[PDB]
Copies of this chain bind each other. A is one copy, B any other.
Amino acid sequence: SLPMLNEDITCDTLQMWEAISVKTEVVGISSLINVHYWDMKRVHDYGAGIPVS
């Protein structure tokens, strides 16, 4: 939610919020290497599970 912000009436002008540079990152990215898990299907016999892909 964005606040009210002062308008004008002589020039019929007003203010609006404008985004300029969004920054982003995935915050759950190092949980992807959780190979040990009680249901992950192994690559072969006595192996590790194949990780999430």
Contacts and interface: CB of A to CB of B under 8 A. Distances in A.
A10 interface: yes
A22 interface: no
Nearest to A9: B9
A12 interface: yes
Interface string A1-43: 0000000011010000000000000000000000000000000
A12 B10 CA distance: 9
A9 B10 CA distance: 8
Nearest to A6: B12
A9 B9 CA distance: 7
Contacts of A9: 9-10, 12
